């Protein structure tokens, strides 16, 4: 039934996929946060070395087909355009908040109360 001509999920599978994608995006740039972190490297198809570790450039030159990944990338881009510093810490904090809220959602708790508590905090 329900001819949609495509693919769909259920309820918790999409949330788990989004949480995993956010965790992967956070772990991608989790080695160049503090002052003791090292730099990365980005190579294309023709052979162009790109040594950088600002976070925003790495997220822009990543090309990921995930909605949460694109949301995090555009958020980091907006943070870099409005300020310029602290482009990875905000993404890490957002990923940690999503991971913490996933455990509350899995505990039979309505997301509205969690959102209200997060806003109050």
């Amino acid at each position: 039934p329900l001819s949609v001509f495509g693919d769909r999920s259920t309820g918790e599978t999409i949330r788990s996929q989004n949480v995993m994608a956010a965790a992967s995006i956070a772990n991608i740039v989790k080695s160049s946060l503090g002052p003791v972190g090292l730099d990365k490297m980005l190579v294309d198809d023709i052979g162009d070395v790109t040594i950088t570790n600002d976070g925003a450039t790495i997220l822009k030159l990543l090309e990921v087909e995930h909605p949460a990944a694109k949301v995090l990338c555009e958020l980091a881009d907006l943070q870099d355009k409005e300020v310029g510093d602290g482009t990875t810490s905000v993404v890490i904090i957002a990923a940690e908040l999503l991971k913490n809220a996933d455990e509350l959602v899995k505990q039979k708790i309505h997301p509205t109360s969690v959102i209200s508590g997060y806003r109050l905090a």
Binding site: P1, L2, P111
Partner: protein, 40 residues
């Protein structure tokens, strides 16, 4: 004592339409009420 029916295609078509409408209503039933979520 009469009123015999020898057609079954309209009945099956109506049943399929009712089933499709019920499936659509069940699919759109999530986004309803003040405690509803958003779809992507």
């Amino acid at each position: 004592k009469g009123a015999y029916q020898d057609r079954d295609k309209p009945a099956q078509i109506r049943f399929s339409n009712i089933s499709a409408a019920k499936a659509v209503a069940d699919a759109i039933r999530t986004s309803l009420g003040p405690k509803g979520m958003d779809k992507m």
